[PDB]
């Protein structure tokens, strides 16, 4: 549900400010986060992939190679209002996109691709939120 996905994204984003400092990241990234769930919007900045990976890691959802920890990702979904069935769905999508996205040494870019694949799957389900 959109409503859930809205709360997830707001909460995934909360620690952005800490990552900064910790990464040297710019304001191109805030424009990418602000626009993320916009239909057809396309993330072009490498450094936004870096920021997602830093956020996910800080939430214990990511191993040091960029892959999803499925258990921890379920725990994060459930903490923010996803029931079981929605959470496991979110998980099957990230995992599916992990498998489909070309492998890449550049974790930041690979993370872009996964996050793009994910966003597209979520619009398809009619779950992408309107983030004011």
Ligand X SMILES: COc1nccnc1CC(C)C
CA distances, 23 to each of 17, 66, 121 (Å) = 10, 16, 29
Using the rule CB under 6 A, is 54 a contact of ligand X? no
Q: Quick check: 5 binds ligand X (CB under 6 A)?
A: yes
Q: Which string of DSSP letters, residue by residue, matches 19-66?
A: HTTSS---SHHHHHHHHTTSTT-----HHHHHHHHHHHHHTT-B-TTS
Interface with ligand X, residue 51, by CB under 6 A = no
Nearer to ligand X, 25 or 36 (CB): 36
Q: Is 43 in the site for ligand X (CB under 6 A)?
A: no
- Alpha-carbon distances, residue 4 vs 1, 10, 37, 69, 129 (angstroms): 5, 10, 13, 20, 9
- 47 near ligand X, judged by CB under 6 A: no
12 binds ligand X per the rule CB under 6 A: yes
x/- letters, 99..118, toward ligand X (CB under 6 A): ------------x--xx--x
Does residue 19 come out as left (phi exceeding 0), alpha (psi in the -120 to 50 range) or beta? Answer: alpha
128 near ligand X, judged by CB under 6 A: no
Closest to ligand X by CB, 24 or 87: 87
Residues near ligand X (CB under 6 A) are 5, 8-9, 12-13, 36, 52, 56, 61, 68, 73, 90, 94, 111, 114-115, 118
């Amino acid at each position: 549900s959109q409503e859930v996905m809205k709360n997830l994204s707001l909460n995934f984003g909360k620690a952005l400010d800490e990552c900064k400092k910790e990464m040297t990241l710019t304001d191109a990234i805030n424009e990418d986060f602000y626009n993320f769930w916009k239909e057809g919007y396309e993330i072009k900045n490498r450094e936004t992939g870096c920021a997602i990976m830093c956020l996910s890691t800080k939430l214990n959802m990511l191993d040091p190679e960029g892959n999803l920890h499925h258990g921890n990702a379920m725990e994060f979904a459930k903490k923010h209002g996803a029931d079981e069935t929605m959470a496991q769905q979110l998980i099957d999508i990230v995992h599916g996109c992990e498998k489909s996205t070309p492998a890449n040494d550049d974790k930041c870019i690979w993370t872009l691709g996964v996050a793009t694949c994910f966003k597209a799957e979520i619009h398809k389900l009619n779950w992408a939120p309107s983030m004011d």
